[PDB]
Design a protein around this nucleic acid. Structure first.
Ligand SMILES: [Ca+2]
Lengths: 81, 70
DNA sequence: TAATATTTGTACGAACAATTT
DNA sequence: AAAATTGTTCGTACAAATATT
């Protein structure tokens, strides 16, 4: 269960939840916590662990895929590029 | 097959506009409300299409302003 | 000058399809 | 044959920024 800094975008440090989830996952990648063609946790596991909606998980992942450090296979899972 | 998902088709149409020069750079495309009434699809679908095209460098957006040809 | 309306942004939920396990 | 997992598509409610009255 990873924690959100969530509250008060009104001043400075606040990021949207999808951006925070994004930072975590990406930090997992280059820190080598998961290597290329290794599977990351399912959208459902991510939902529970970050305490956010599937929509928010899919946005975070959708972005990282488009950056090209993840790739997805429908029905298979999502993997470090 | 010739089938493409709805967001891909909205994507195609908008793109064609751009490269046929029906909207030039720094020029505005229809709003999301207009795009959805014209394609008869959801705001979500419209936002998905536009998001992809921003991500590929074809468009930029300004919250509260609108969306524009890059 | 200040309210209001308009428009894009983030974030929750729902149901079903398509593909893989 | 079923179950699990990602894909598409609809919906609702506010927040935040800009553009209009
Ligand atoms: Ca406006």
């Amino acid at each position: 269960l990873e924690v959100l800094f969530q509250g008060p975008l009104g001043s400075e440090f606040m990021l949207p939840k999808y951006a925070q989830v994004k930072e975590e996952i990406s930090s997992w990648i280059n820190q080598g916590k998961i290597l290329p063609d290794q599977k990351i946790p399912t959208e459902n596991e991510l939902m529970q662990q970050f305490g956010v909606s599937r929509h928010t998980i899919r946005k975070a992942i959708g972005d990282l895929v488009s950056q090209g450090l993840l790739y997805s296979v429908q029905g298979g899972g999502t993997f470090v590029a």
